[PDB]
Structure formats: structure tokens, C-alpha cells
């Protein structure tokens, strides 16, 4: 009767490559949207008092991403990481990432 709070947790799975190379897995390769590291999606836990509403993590194909959910970029000095992502793969693109989301909630009473 008091309602609930809702929060969609968002994390990004990251891959890199050398031009002419292949897309490859890394260690802890998960970051937030700005590229700062975070736990791998499957290790993420609700804060105390919260519960998952979605049973599974999902990736949203309506955003500007390809058919597998990836968006693409390259690192342009002076920067040390990609800043601008695009939906379409091209041979000179060296980074890609995929956005995973999951809804959790907290009942207010």
C-alpha cells in the first residue's frame, strides 16, 4: 500500500581487438557506462533490503546496437578510452561493448 522503489541495474560487457584480429574475452571485463570497472553481471547482488524483479539479465536490441547487442568505438588520443559508440561494426573499430540490464525493487512497507 506504500508502493515500491525500482532501479534498473546497468552494466557493460567489453571486448577489444587488433584491426584484422578477432574479438576476444578479457578478465573482469565489465564496466559502467563511463568505462569504470565493476563486478561481472552474474556477481552483482541486491543491496540490503532489495530484491530482483527480473529473473534474468537482458540486453535491449532497440538501442543503437547490432543484432547481438554490441556497439562499437575506437580510442582517439589524447583519450585513453573510447567515448563515442556506434551501432555498426567496421574493420578499424577496436572496441565493442554490450549493455546488460536487470530490474530490482524495494518495498516501502
Could you tell me the resolution of this structure in angstroms?
2.2
Between CA 99 and CA 13 the distance in angstroms is: 7
Between CA 70 and CA 75 the distance in angstroms is: 16
Q: Where are the beta strands (DSSP E) in 1-109?
A: 4-16, 30-31, 51-52, 70-73, 95-107
Between CA 49 and CA 107 the distance in angstroms is: 8
Between CA 12 and CA 36 the distance in angstroms is: 10
| Method used experimentally | X-ray
Cβ atoms within 10 A of the Cβ of 48, count?
6
Cβ atoms within 10 A of the Cβ of 57, count?
15
Q: Where are the beta strands (DSSP E) in 17-107?
A: 30-31, 51-52, 70-73, 95-107
Report the alpha-carbon angle 21-28-14, nearest 5. Answer: 45
How many structural domains are present in the chain? 1
Question: Domain containing 70: what range?
Answer: 1-109
Cβ atoms within 10 A of the Cβ of 83, count?
11
Strand partners, 37: 31
Amino acid at each position: 500500500d506504500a508502493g515500491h522503489l525500482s532501479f534498473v541495474e546497468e552494466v557493460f560487457e567489453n571486448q577489444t581487438r587488433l584491426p584484422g584480429g578477432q574479438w576476444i574475452y578479457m578478465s573482469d571485463n565489465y564496466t559502467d557506462v563511463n568505462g569504470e570497472k565493476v563486478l561481472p553481471k552474474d556477481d552483482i547482488e541486491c543491496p540490503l533490503g532489495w530484491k530482483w524483479e527480473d529473473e534474468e539479465w537482458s540486453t535491449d536490441l532497440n538501442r543503437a546496437v547490432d543484432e547481438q547487442g554490441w556497439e562499437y568505438s575506437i580510442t582517439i588520443p589524447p583519450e585513453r578510452k573510447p567515448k563515442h559508440w556506434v551501432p555498426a561494426e567496421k574493420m578499424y573499430y577496436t572496441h565493442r561493448r554490450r549493455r546488460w540490464v536487470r530490474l530490482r525493487r524495494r518495498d516501502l512497507s
